[PDB]
């Protein structure tokens, strides 16, 4: 198993873990802030997914310092994992194309 597919798999598993820990930590950070909506676990999980994908529905967001910090980690983990998959696909394409040429 080549490095890029291992990394892609590792990144995926890591992202799922970041999503779950982020849903938990967001609820713990946001309860106690008046007006916060990011305060039950199922919808926090939905929120951490829409944050990692940057899908931008705007139905849920953190209002506290630590929930925003948690949100930043989730954004970066999401954007980064997806970028890694692209890099892994590009390594595949570039290698399969060397072969098509002989090299």
């Amino acid at each position: 198993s080549a490095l890029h597919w291992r990394a892609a798999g590792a990144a995926t598993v890591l992202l799922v873990i970041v999503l779950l820990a982020g849903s938990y930590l967001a609820v713990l950070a946001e309860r106690g802030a008046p007006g916060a909506q990011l305060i039950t676990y199922p919808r926090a999980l939905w929120w951490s997914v829409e944050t990692a994908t940057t899908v931008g529905y705007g139905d849920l967001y953190p209002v506290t310092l630590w929930g925003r910090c948690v949100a930043v980690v989730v954004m970066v983990a999401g954007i980064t994992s997806f970028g890694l998959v692209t890099a892994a696909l590009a390594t595949w394409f570039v290698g399969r194309e060397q072969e098509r040429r002989g090299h």
């Epitope: 938990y24 713990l28 309860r31 106690g32 802030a33 008046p34 007006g35 909506q37 305060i39 199922p42």
Partner: antibody
Framework: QVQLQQPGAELVKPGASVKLSCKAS????????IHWVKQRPGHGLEWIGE????????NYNEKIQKKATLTADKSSSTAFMQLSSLTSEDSAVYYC???????????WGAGTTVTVSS | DILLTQSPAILSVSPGERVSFSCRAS??????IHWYQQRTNGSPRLLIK???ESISGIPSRFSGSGSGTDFTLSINSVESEDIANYYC?????????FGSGTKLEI
Amino acid sequence: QVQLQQPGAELVKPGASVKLSCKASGYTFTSDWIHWVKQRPGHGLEWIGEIIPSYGRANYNEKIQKKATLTADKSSSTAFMQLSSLTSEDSAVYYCARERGDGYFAVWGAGTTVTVSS
Amino acid sequence: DILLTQSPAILSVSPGERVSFSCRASQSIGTDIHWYQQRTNGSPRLLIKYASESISGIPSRFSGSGSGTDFTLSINSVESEDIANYYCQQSNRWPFTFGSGTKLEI
């Protein structure tokens, strides 16, 4: 089973303090919150505060005079509410209830009748 | 903080009739409303969650409806054991809050 056990009654002299217990049973998860709710005779339900025992973080109703301090003993699955410097206004039934972090109170304790008197 | 208005405070109904408790939220809260029943000197009992979801152990007689600001708890066919105070509660926004309560009377 009885999932939340509370003492039936506490008598408190005005100015003094009392630590109410709430022993939990049944399924306990790291994600559970225990809430506390005050019911003065013949009146409605009043949310006091919440604790997550598997971390010890507690939040409070900031709209009322802060009388309460929430703690939890992971070892004994018991949540405590320390009510301090009480007056007749603090005489009530205090319920604890368990919430699975999904917004509602699935189970309550029988409640503790607190009486502030000499 | 989200205000939950329950009016009227008392509801007088005849046995077997349908009955509807109103719960109105000061702002839009989706379906994030739950309903408790409390009889004379008992603790509150979860009746309905998320505005319409059944709770195991609760008579099918009970149902809920609404979304946004206006929520209704309903009892097909009222009977004596339904005498109680009925409270709604929201989990949309911190802190959780309760409605002021509606007493059922037969």
